[PDB]
Design a binder for these strands. Structure first.
Length: 220
RNA sequence: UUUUU
C-alpha cells in the first residue's frame, strides 16, 4: 500500500479566453528574494547608476569606494538619510577626521536617497551587533527616538528594511519610531512657482503727451 | 509611494 503524493494547481484560474494564462511550471520555481521585488528600495539599475556617480565626483576607484561606503554607511546610521541633509559627512581615518561633500552624493540617486541606503540595511544591521558585544552602542537616530531598549539597537536607523522572518518584536518598535519621526511631516506638491506675476506696459511715450496720456473731453 | 537628518 504505497503512499500517494498530492499536488494541486489550477482550481479557479484567470481563464481569459477559455485557457489558463499562468505558467504553473515557471511559478513553482519562481521564488525570488523578497527584497528583490520590493518598491521600497532602488532597483539594481538605479543602484548601479548611483555607484558610478559617486565615483566620478569623488574621483576614487573601486577599492576607494569600498572604504568610503563603510564610512558613509556608519554616518548614515547615526544621521538619518533625509533628502534635506547638507554640508559634509565625516569618517575617521585612523585618528584624523576627513570630510566629503554630501551634495554630489545626493544628485545621482534617481529615487529618494533612503531607497539607495536601503541596499545597505542588511550590512548596517550586522554592524550594530558587532559594536554591541563589548560596549553599549546606540545609533544617534535611536537616541533621538528615546528608545530605552538596548537589545533593540539592531533596528535604530531610518533606512531599515522590514523582513518576513528577521524581526519579531522589532516590527512594532520600528513602526513606532517611524510614526513618531513623521508626526509633523508636511506633504505639499507645489509651492512658490517661478512666475512673478506683475504686468507689461506697451504704450508709446512722446513729448507732446502727459506722464500717461493726453487729456480729452475736459472743459473748464 | 514618498515623507525619519
Amino acid at each position: 500500500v504505497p503512499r500517494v503524493k498530492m499536488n494541486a494547481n489550477k482550481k479557479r484560474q484567470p481563464m481569459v479566453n477559455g485557457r489558463a494564462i499562468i505558467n504553473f511550471q515557471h511559478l513553482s520555481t519562481y521564488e525570488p528574494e523578497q527584497f528583490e521585488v520590493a518598491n521600497t528600495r532602488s532597483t539594481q539599475e538605479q543602484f548601479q547608476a548611483w555607484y558610478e556617480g559617486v565615483k566620478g565626483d569623488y574621483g576614487v576607484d573601486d577599492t576607494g569606494m569600498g572604504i568610503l561606503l563603510n564610512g558613509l554607511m556608519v554616518w548614515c546610521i547615526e544621521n538619518g538619510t533625509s533628502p534635506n541633509i547638507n554640508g559634509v559627512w565625516t569618517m575617521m581615518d585612523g585618528d584624523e577626521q576627513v570630510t566629503y561633500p554630501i551634495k554630489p552624493l545626493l544628485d545621482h540617486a534617481v529615487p529618494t536617497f533612503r531607497q539607495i541606503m536601503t541596499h545597505f540595511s542588511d550590512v548596517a544591521e550586522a554592524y550594530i551587533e558587532m559594536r554591541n558585544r563589548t560596549k553599549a552602542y546606540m545609533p544617534r537616530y535611536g537616541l533621538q527616538r528615546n528608545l530605552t531598549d538596548m537589545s533593540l539597537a539592531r533596528y535604530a536607523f531610518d533606512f531599515y528594511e522590514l523582513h518576513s522572518t528577521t524581526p519579531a518584536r522589532a516590527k512594532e518598535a520600528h513602526l513606532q519610531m517611524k510614526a513618531a519621526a513623521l508626526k509633523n511631516a508636511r506633504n505639499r506638491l507645489f509651492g512658490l512657482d517661478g512666475n512673478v506675476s506683475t504686468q507689461e506696459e506697451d504704450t508709446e511715450r512722446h513729448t507732446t503727451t502727459d506722464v500717461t496720456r493726453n487729456i480729452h473731453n475736459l472743459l473748464g
